[model samples]
Target chain A: VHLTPEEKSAVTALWGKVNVDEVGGEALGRLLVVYPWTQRFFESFGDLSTPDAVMGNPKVKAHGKKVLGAFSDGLAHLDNLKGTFATLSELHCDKLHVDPENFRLLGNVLVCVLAHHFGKEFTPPVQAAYQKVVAGVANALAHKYH
Target chain B: VLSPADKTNVKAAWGKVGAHAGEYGAEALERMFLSFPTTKTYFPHFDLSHGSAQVKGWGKKVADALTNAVAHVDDMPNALSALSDLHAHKLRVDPVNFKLLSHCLLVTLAAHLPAEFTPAVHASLDKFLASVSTVLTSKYR
Candidate 1:
């Protein structure tokens, strides 16, 4: 989807204002609550069966921060979407061997968490923008991992 | 060489430990600077002073880079070569600093992850750090 400069600005401005580490950590906790199977990939998180358990686990919290931080790093270079997505595709697909469905779950969880955190600021337009970004990430991650 | 199990444990432990990368990273940098004072020579322009934002920020940067490198452990040469290129070309940081930072980072990880930091984990991390050091310093040769 082509984002007008104003739309991109609104999205980036909203995103930049939030604490990515905090929201990212909360999103992971939510993901664990909704998609417990995803935790299988994280030995540190595998034992934790509930959202509270996962959130309380220091390792999970840290992993959340790192994952979100890495996502932020990739988004910072939106101008190079091809290169950014390609690198991510390689990392998630080749190195991590992550299931493509997991990315979809992640996108849903992230969008939900952002909506929860942003409150009224996450209007339909902003939500649409963020969803598009998540979709872009999902598309990139799914590139070749059909 | 680390077996798959060793690598898995290493990655898990690091994920937990690296969550506080800013704090742990700062401590590691502090230890590095204290033990190997000459490493501070590279940051003449910045305030590497104790507890300063620059010191802390530098720690986060290093920690962040290492965090990203964890996923690419299989291709360590390519994983960390960019660091080497930056240090070797632009930053001109001393090669020894990388080795020193690795040592400090291990110590920090051990302190943070004593339960998961088993002998095998230690050896795996050491081997990984050593390899990272090798690639990071390859520019020197």
Candidate 2:
């Protein structure tokens, strides 16, 4: 799954555009903040009421599941990117391929986006956890990528 | 477990209550955590004292992503496990924390949305929390 530089840039641009252009940006943004990895709130469902009837319709449910899976998988790709950069750092492979800042941006994007959704319930400990990973990447790059 | 009819009602109510986030979202959530100070330690910055508009902004972001999650609860076990793995990278918080948090949040919901809250509604929420609590705790064993 090698992406050309242009392709990568296009995808990132698209992430921004779809989030704002295709959807009611602010409203959609709020939803993103509320998102937890699992929808625990959905569990106690005893009756499929009105909005559930509309949104939980089989077709809608399928579509939402597909989107959620894709989003989670996409987030995982950051780990791959981090590994690649980490290797570069160790090899002293030159700063060209090692972008610590970029990886940090990726992790923060998730924390910011996710924390925004789940709010205080999402836990600040998780955000701090993410920051630790980013800091490690940054430190490795500083020590080796240069 | 709720009857199919109850599930429908619960989902609809969830959407309405979720929308009231701007009025009671994070501040309400922070108060819930504060009910037990140990839980408050789990949150680094949920200052109820500050009128942080940022709370409302962040709340909406989660709601969108979470709504999708609500639409797909069947796959929650895997999802919860994966999330636990991510968190394991940092701290080793007990899975019981989620249940405790759920209990507190339910109380918060009642406090903030009493107009819409009802006995049936509370029961539905309890059922929902139990379902996910099982999945969330499954990873530890």
Candidate 3:
């Protein structure tokens, strides 16, 4: 759960260009859609019971915005990664009983969104830095479980 | 989860916030809306004027909810169960607002009750609020 100085700068730099409002929706919606089983665990909003306007659903996007915000919070507190996710860890593990495996799934979707949108800007070194950040985020969110 | 000292500190901190919980809640919400203008979208129905009575009413609910959490620190899941369900379905609110509001509440207490907001008490109240939000945001059956 550590961030190298160069990785920190890389993450912060790319994050500045992230249109969270636009990208957030696609990222979380992709999660609930692609990994349907994860829906039960991440039913933060909307009835994704059907393909009914899945991505356009405001509820879905709103939750996506929240997910992005959580990442932004992580980015803001790189030095205190666990502190950033203390509430999330307990919510996912102690209360909702979510399997930590899905943590990586959502993290991957987030990376996909950045890669798809950022294109050439999402360079190999940048992608590597992002991976480390997501790994730290996933680990922090799953740390409370036995 | 909290330690014995955690409970002790919130008890002492809440003592300072006792009579003024409602006022504190309003001020905290005010701080949140101003600091994070995006958050005001959730309260679109309310009159989000610089100092509206609408916020005052919701602020009371906020204060009461925190008071309830403080009273039942050991059992936040059940204590805040109703609100949890409300957030999940009725409100469908974004989860980021919870953390933002929590941050504002901490600042509110700090600005208003600096003497009572000792480092130990600050950490205790933070953990208490974090625990409360954890239970309140969990997806349920």
Best by TM-score: 3
lDDT of 2: 0.45
Off by over 4 Å in 1: A144-146, B1-141
What is the lDDT of every predicted structure here? 0.69, 0.45, 0.80
Fraction of native contacts under 8 Å reproduced by each candidate: 0.00, 0.00, 0.00
- Model 1 chain B is weakest, by summed lDDT over 10 consecutive residues, at B114-123
Question: lDDT tens string, model 3, A2-112?
Answer: 667888899999999988877888887887766665566545565686656668889888878887887887788877888889899878654565656667888898889
Candidate 2's docking class is incorrect
How big is the positional error of residue A72 in model 3, measured in Å on the Cα after superposition? Answer: 23
Per-residue accuracy of model 1 over B7-125 as CA lDDT, tens digit each: 68668877887568788788777766654567778767977777899888888887777777677777777877778888777876766577667766665665556466543455567
For model 3, the docking class works out as incorrect
Off by over 4 Å in 3: A1-47, A50-110, A113-146
Report the C-alpha lDDT of model 1 over A103-132, residue by residue, as the tens digit. Answer: 766775676566555554655456556656
Superposition error at B111 for model 3 (Å): 1.6
Task: Report lDDT (Cα) of residue A120, candidate 2.
Answer: 48
**TM-score for predicted model 1 compared with the true structure:** 0.48
